[model samples]
Target: DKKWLGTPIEEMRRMPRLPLLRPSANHTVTIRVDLLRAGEVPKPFPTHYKDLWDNKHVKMPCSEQNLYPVEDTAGSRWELIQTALLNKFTRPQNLKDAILKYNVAYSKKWDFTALIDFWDKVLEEAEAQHLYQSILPDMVKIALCLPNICTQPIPLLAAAMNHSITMSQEQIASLLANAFFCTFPRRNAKMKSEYSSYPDINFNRLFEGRSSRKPEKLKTLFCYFRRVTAAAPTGLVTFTRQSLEDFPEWERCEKPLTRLHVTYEGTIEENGQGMLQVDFANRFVGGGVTSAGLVQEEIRFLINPELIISRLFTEVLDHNECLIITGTEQYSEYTGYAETYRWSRSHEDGSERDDWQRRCTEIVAIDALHFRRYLDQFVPEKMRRELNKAYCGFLRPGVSSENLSAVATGNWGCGAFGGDARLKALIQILAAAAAERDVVYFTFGDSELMRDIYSMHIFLTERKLTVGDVYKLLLRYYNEECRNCSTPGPDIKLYPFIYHAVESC
Candidate 1:
């Protein structure tokens, strides 16, 4: 009832990628000739100054269509930010001061306790002085360089359809530097997400909380700032919001399940080279990265700070949609997940640069349904939604079969969200099969999962079952097992039922 496992080392090797997309409707690249290598002006799209809010420049969160206008004044928020970060002198204290001065609404709550704690514990007096005076001053210069580097009104990638935003690494660094100094208005501790839906963008969350992970996160963040300020990257990175209008007919489809390399051990970051790494994300993408959640998604954003820029404009992901970020450079290495997380060292991302000068990498962010009841996932409607989401992320249009890479993922929605791994694995399999992509599943050292997946896969392949066949088999399992019981029993599981349902074959 399954396909043979191909040699992953050989079959899953990185495919030499084709050049990225050309300028098209709904696909906007901030940089001009640099992406084309046409030897022309490398500046960005002209900024819409009419939408300018205050002296505070740069795109605001959730400015979906016309640019959100800033306010004017002498003692305004941006003015205070400039006074703090742009001035000749700076310290960790100065950042907090500028932040609180603007966000008077949060003057009582958000504090620099954790920020200063990290400074005092990790950095000595001389080190602090160097960071405050030398590196941070250069940080402002790089931040202010945003005006020339990214002269564009970034649109909020709101829900509904497919949209893409491509900008240079330098532009993103400037934007990130400004984010560090807390220059973005209305997005601060004000918590005024009144109407527009977007993830939290400010650094206040990263600075406010007092947790063991905070220092590790700051260490990782400062590592990014220092490296970026020293030498801003010239490559381009793209963030595409991929959406699907209709669901695949799982019962009638006939795509053969592709080969898989299920690892008993290994990680997506280390072992998933040249593949589309999966971000088991929160619906509000980059979930708690700026704050405290220190699992896969947060760790990813920490290592590749460029990913954090998505929160500035990306709205919460809707069903049938996922976010694909390409060419992000990793900056820091860490040793743990969750409460035990530790930032070990600065990493040099020597990942190969592709035709577009982007690192030869693509990460698809898919947020699985959080099963609060845990029983709801067995229903057909919920399964359909999950299937659609996986397909949305796995589908990479314009790339031929020869150039498509496998989807690298593990126990998505299985950990914190309490998903059943057996169910998730099959959904991914069907979705990847339909998209004509292979998969490399990391069991995260779960030998039992590895064994179960291998056996289930071989069984399905032995019968040469099409994706539709397995899809119908699953529906049959639901009808016979889950529907009769109305709730999944602790002893009853998807894999066991799958084995029994297809046993006669």
Candidate 2:
């Protein structure tokens, strides 16, 4: 019964404010706040910010029924989207017909059965009236105003140097509406197309929508739509792509394990409130939010629909990079996971807004490498990749070191990704330690894991261990124990092996 280390639970919950709102050569801000307060049409001053719509083909007019426009819409895509989505009265089939007009190829292949079923069987007729008449019209209006609202290009947070894009809530909603209508060009191309490596942005999958859990997804999404359409939020959200130049020189670092609160009871979003919540993401962010994959990161996107807009511009993450989103507000409470999932009710977020009118919330998405063979993750390169990725997320530049917030995370990459939970927990703790942040790790209701991880933490803390110590230990353990094993059997588990090694030391 080994007890673990901790900071005050309240201390771990403090919001981290990285005051990166000022315009710089590196930061791309879509709306100038002072200009907006003066009621000017929001636009990025071209000198400080670069536009992301750098594509020659996509930047062209969407109205003319020729060239790129003609391939999809016999008419202008903008006009088609407007006619389809902005109607005073519209239905599922009506929406389907318009979507099919432009994405003509999908007409025969895709299924609208799930979306139709949601409207027909899930929502009451009165509720349907609000969505079609009250909500969608506003969303479509936002979608149509793309050119005027965002006069300058929003920079793409591609895998490059450290870059960030911050936009007003109105801009995000506009982008989301455009995404809903699938209007962004080059985005809908097949796998081998230019954007093949990126995550799908279209709602076509939600339309293909056959997964039994889709009603819940729509319920959650529409609520965000309803809230924004009714009264568009005035705050801002920032998505920063953080890329480190090098993997940590693990052998030299003297950083010790930081504070940790281990529990099997809660989610990072709820328990780690106001902290930097971890998103176990895919390199192509928002992995299956539009499809059937409803896991941790996908659910995070579904609940905070504003986060989904990021998929449109955020390129695939490199091994040394992570995506940090600051100030997104969650819209709905959900009741289950995957097949049994349900959208419980609307959650009106009251988080405090920052100087730039951003919600005082931060989320860092770090993808873990999938270990198909289970034993394969012990390979030094992949293990270090995991550490570097987590560190990139955790070590995100803080506004100041004063009152650094803790990281709220859980069994990252442990489920379908086939990671060793014990090893991953150590990696996360080491990364957080290196980043100089505390940790609140949720074990997803695993009682034994909760105890083992807690013991593991105490083991490291009691020895006054450095990050390099444990990393070197992992390599040693892999060489001595995991080298010949094709699968886990009678081999010593990582925790016990680590505990014994520490004891013998």
Candidate 3:
């Protein structure tokens, strides 16, 4: 496993790469590859690449105002920094300042295991800003391994949009190299497509992590033939099992086998540059350009990659991108550009069945871990009420105006522990269950009412108090929490409102 070597900012400085950012309307040709032999692998499969752009919407980080807001609470800066680090290739200096100001420190590991551990903090911020989207995962877990030599990105994903200017041609090439790329063999009946000699995805390793061959034969750079005038060399190449050994001469060639047909839709699109094609396998079109020194133009897959294959297991001996199964048929309609092929390896123990789903689990776990931290702190009675109220507002079921903590007096003290354990557990269970079911967790009413029920249950259970005293406390709790939740900052929305920002909960 490669480690997360440095901060996003430091990584940016070491190797500044350019991302494509253009807003338009164009046709998107999708070629889906389905690895027929599959059990389950812990990796993400979809890879994104730009084939040709015409009127397509390609938004980069810096230029577009992220649909998500950046949190700026006095104590939540660390959360914001974590969000930045996980969401982009590099982070900006201002984010570092926020981290420092909030007393949050980066992990000192050479590899970024600590950073991965802290992913929840970013999720919290994202939830607060209403920016939690499926697309964010690619930036967080999968791309974290990009070799860090580039400068950190500016605060709030500012770099994603700024590539419209200031990147050198070489920088653009290097960035794409950091992405996932692969190659598969393709055979043409009438014409010879270069993919006739690429390898298939290792179905064995994809499932069981077992393969008969070693990976030295598959080294080749992936290039975006559209970007450069002359075909610059690519990074790693994808070869078919048959071609892996028999036609090994390309390794000695300067350009070698730069093109791998992970998937080719057989259709083309037009952009300012000219006609471009969209093909995919493991989700990337044209496999992908290998990292750093392997390729000339830095070409990245247009979508997110869950895992990076470090080696290849096959070769392309004919026009068909066929797997060299011992007794497999020579060609089937399923073997061409029209059919989607998923090359996979065996699944290793503990590997997640769904890479993206695993990410959500980790993110939710982060919150569960930190929620415990908030418990350990000795909050003042007043603050405790505030915290409860703020949490409740976000909970839904709609708390009554009377339950707002702003109205709670300082009189009630102590005996608060053990009062709401089951309720807390129940609420969390509800949230987690909602997540598992792929259902949105909150509605305006649920947020308000749950807090009221939670407070009433705790008050009645803990103090042996009746609705008489509890009624007064509920009113105060509701107001106080709402006040805190409604606080607004630059691009930031505090709790209650913050949680509401999550479109999917």
Candidate 4:
């Protein structure tokens, strides 16, 4: 009698699951190369400059294995940030009075004098829409190309177990010109140290302004550094990180659900061309648009502004981790949503490239668990750590069989993490039917979540049901909604108890 589905098999095996972790050989895989094309340099290691604290012309010399010193200079952190904005506006003659006294002293310690009258009405609407002084010298060479401090040691999680960095395009425009002069390094500490789980990488809250879409968000960050200094992108990109031990049971998968559609049209980076595009991220991965977040991962970091240099030395993403990204490059293009968005121009993707030259535009990123109390994501060890973080970014390592090509999500964590978009579309159709792959869900227009995920994938494909029978009927409807403590319908009484658990399978 399956005891009326109420949970007791040894109290559901004492609940709290997420354990699995067996592969080892002392791991080790880091990559990060590019000594102008690996001409050489890689053996120093130790690196720590205690968050370079005000860099004092570098020099922490120590070694004898104490390992320290290494400052090859020439990038005086953008000449001390344009000499701290020319000593905060005193030397201003014009350039519109030094950009309105340095945007009113960088929002006067967050007092935000109306963001200095909204960047003086967006510098008079960028001098009447475009040609604003020929793009103000590419924002002063993006504050004079900042990329210094590293002459030797590297190790900022130089991958203890699987990693890959590879970058170029003038090392991603000198790391987005030191994130447009916020000059990273303990990024305005709050407490949690060692990048206390990084993310908000200072762009000074995208120039604070109680939103109204800050002048099309400063013209999409000045049309992406004016087409990235007009032609400095030579190619070469990679961000990899992989580690697996198999993990997708989802009720013993005999794989069935393959091609499920559910649209409302466009986006998963424009219908996920050639597939594999998800991102919906933020475990310190460009979420909240590097602080002062917008939405949908801050309009995807305002049209892929070089995915904000993977927040320099990416780390702080764990929930069975994920972060793929391969050859990012999409400059700008917008229309509306979230205060009728704007920045409608500069776009030239023309995608195509793969034997690892990248560019077919990959993107993985993951990160979705922020429940905060919707019964803390109905804990079964946080829904199996978001089903192994979407099966660690939809499996596909040393492939066994699942020729890949079919993922392009939407409403992931149901916008801003309130989640429950029909239980994350049945946990991404049971992680794409246990990675046998086949999904195209986008409901961004949510026509009632695309008619309840197209009537639950046509009633689980006319009741054939196998992704291990809808993962054992979603663990017997999450143990009958935790023994009627209650809360699981609106699917007009939960699709007739999931059609009587698929007619008792």
Candidate 5:
């Protein structure tokens, strides 16, 4: 018999768990290279290799036909995953800044009362779409009824600790409840999906509201803060004008904007040889939890030292960020990209449409001039002109040459992941579109967000597309370009993309 404190010896039933896959496809290997530095392009192979096994020489076989060796495939896969995670989780502060900046503008239109009003209309519209007569509470109940998880406790705690030294339990509880219900359930549902996860805690509400009918999250935050800040009473227009002189693409309110555009052509095995993969994958998750958690905790810990329970709250936040979600992608890359772009834009699934022109078209169409301004403003002037030159190297083969030149400084180490200069430019283009009023960017899930950013960051940094040395470069880019951050250091493992205080400076 089993008791609460201890279990007595009982017959052990051996129920064998089935292995999920005969050959687990999740086990992958990654390899990276700078195509330009390798001097010449990789040897071309017939798209349809004749396989001796299947069609008596119709499809490619593993033995003689495979161009890349498979000796360390697992290692490579691990490295890719790790590298992707590392880069994604590295910049906590920048993500915070992205959210703060965008929310400042969003708060004007959708403060708490306004959010309630907007949601009422949203419910009406949703009802209109489905043909129903539902009340606001019913809509909330429905929304919250499903698995809508979020970081309501963290943000509320942080808010209580930071802004309001005398924040009451009632106020804190209400804020927490609002934030949790408003964010968690819907977000958790989204994060659980692969084709639908994009967490909502952000800055784009100014450029793009969060609904088919109305946007209201900002209204909640505004109302919450209005009770605290007591000094600045602002609206979306004023907020936009102040934050967006440097961000003109998001400033326009009239035309429909293009929010996000993602494109990925290569496969996991398409990169080159002679690179580390397993090491990189593990590296990606390391320090992510610790760093990210520290930052989150620090935010609350440092907030209003005079406040009651301030120290306890601070410790809790820090511990939470550090302890939770360790060795996972949740807090890492997802947050990194959430600060600026849509998660769907970086999809690697074969199902994604392959249209380079359309991708560029959508980006330019959403906010052409403003995006161009960013190119001039964020990506150093000299580098912007040379981005195309960097992309050409991808067409080349391996990291071997007299094939090496200034144009191709042996572009390996970081070429495999997608965060190259060229890819980043595309993301910037998307970010510009996201800031437009009419654009609606949707992501399938949070995992892809992490994976995509990690992949991209690894690819770009390895190829030298990024400015500055590794550490500071991502933060710089996050603030000036993508606008994402967690409150903590890069300890994304715990709470991946919470951007409540999005101040970039």
Candidate 6:
């Protein structure tokens, strides 16, 4: 059967499939996540962060070019005090004059001597922290790179959800460098303004004289810059925010369970690589880290400083929507939560890439409803809202074990949102079932939720119950719990409804 063209034409046709043609590669097509179409006008990128960097009126020389002739002498001390403001800023068109003018404005509002004294203290701290050497270049780069006045970022969350923005690592580095310099304008206004609803994003608190954690934060940032400067990352990353649409009614659907899995250790970011990881996020995005608050979002932002970019334009998220970020890299690791948090060191994320050459990591940010009272969330409206939110994020059409990885999630709203751990767990499981996605629940050190969910899984699996059955059963159980609450008793088992439903079956 051999032919003149080859050993055998049939043999050639049957050769092993090309690696580049695999579904993993095809599924990873270069995507444009932008929500806006041509001719659509985006909201103005607010000047909140702009003013901190652009002060074009006062011209100044580069402060580093005018260093004092001697060190630790009276002449040097005076020079340092005189030049602190100018040196703190970079790319000033005229450095000396900028410092003088900046000083004059501050003097009108406060004691001139006190202002100078504060500058003296700041200079001393910079030297102590070994920050003087790095700060000059950082500030100058930030100032010069500031986007023009007419070129505004899409500043509303609603706008962002409607459009996806594609950015490269180099562009991200430049924006982050601006953040590092704290050049954002009107960033610290005490009065209400257009940005009153926005979360505070200035780095002033981190730089002010006496915060204990400044050095550690600086270390993390320095490491990030060091990596970027060594060789800026190449490739485009996309951020797409999705709003809920046409979701099926869980109570009515007859969908059955496909598969289920569980884990008690690690976090979504650490263990969920190669799969869709969930971000237990807030509507304001970075949560309180941009302001005075701290928790899950803050911890997440600190470890992945790149996520902070979402703050630039992401508006407060609505309950019916979520965000999906692709290709953002994790830069740092940390220990502790909230006030006890400490930046550990740089993280070397060796995550694999998809066909698009994007890191094989996707994160769906879904915020749970925050309840003021524990009893308030058992109501139908709130319950349905949370269900839709999770489902909107978890549901991926054309799902198959081969193409879609099981979702990895944990006690999503069980933290600051004041959700019952068991209730939230069941809600997620139900939502995933409705969407035909398997679940990999991470309990994150909570042994009781782990054991309880495990038992629940065993009970349900043994019965081979459908998602519709569980949905209806949940309503029955919740009502029973409410009645039992009025009567009072020993603590109720978390999933009494599941227990009763199983007992009857």
TM-score for each of the candidates: 0.90, 0.91, 0.18, 0.33, 0.19, 0.72
Window of ten residues with lowest summed lDDT in model 3: 360-369
Off by over 4 Å in 6: 1-130, 146-161, 185-193, 205-215, 397-402, 483-491
Candidate 5, residues 77-165, lDDT tens digits: the string is 22222222222211223222322221332334433432334434443555332312222222223223211221111212221121111
Q: Whose TM-score is higher: candidate 5's or candidate 6's?
A: 6
Model 3: how far residue 344 lies from native, Å: 26
Q: The CA-based lDDT of model 3 is what?
A: 0.21
TM-score winner: 2
- Alpha carbon lDDT of each predicted model: 0.78, 0.77, 0.21, 0.58, 0.22, 0.57
Root-mean-square deviation of every model: 4.1, 3.3, 28.0, 19.0, 28.8, 12.5
Looking at candidate 5, what is the lDDT of residue 423?
34
**CA error at residue 137 for candidate 6, angstroms:** 1.6
Tens digits of lDDT, candidate 4, 353-383: 4433446677788889877656556556666
Those runs of model 1 whose alpha carbons end farther than 4 Å from true positions after fitting are 1-6, 17-22, 34-42, 47-77, 88-91, 189-196, 484-490
Poorest lDDT segment (10 consecutive residues) of candidate 4? 12-21
Candidate maximizing lDDT: 1
Write down the TM-score for model 5: 0.19
1 against 5, candidate with superior lDDT:
1
Question: Candidate 2 — which residues are off by over 4 angstroms?
Answer: 1-5, 16-20, 36-53, 56-75, 84-90, 397-400, 486-490
Candidate 3 structure quality by residue, lDDT tens digits, 1-505: 2111111211111100112322222211111113211233211112323221112221222222212333652333223334544533222232223223312222121122222222323225553222223323332332233222112221110111211111112222323332221111121122554322332221111111112111110111111212211322111111111111121111122211111111111211111011011111211212322211111011111111111221121222121121111100001011111112221322112212121111110100000111232223222332333233222212212333222111100101112221223223222222222112111111112334334433333333444432223223333333444334433221331223322422223
The digit string of per-residue lDDT tens for model 1 on 1-505 reads 2222335646684644355556677977777643355223245666532244332233542123223235652334444455555555445666677666556667777878788887777678887777877777788888766556666666677788588888888889888887876767666534455424677777877887569889889888988999978875767798989888877998999889888888776788788888899999998999999887889899999999999998887778999889999989999988978988988888998788677767787899999988877767778888888988999999877667766888898899987577889889999989999999888998886777877887888888878999899999878766777676754463567888888877865
Q: 1 or 3, which is superior by TM-score? A: 1
Q: Candidate order by TM-score, highest to lowest? A: 2, 1, 6, 4, 5, 3
- Residue 275 error, candidate 2, Å: 1.1
Question: CA shift at 46, candidate 4, in angstroms?
Answer: 12
* Residue range with the least summed lDDT across 10 consecutive positions in model 5: 234-243
Q: For model 1, which pairs clash?
A: 1-459, 1-460, 1-461, 1-463, 2-459, 2-460, 2-461, 2-462, 3-461, 53-70
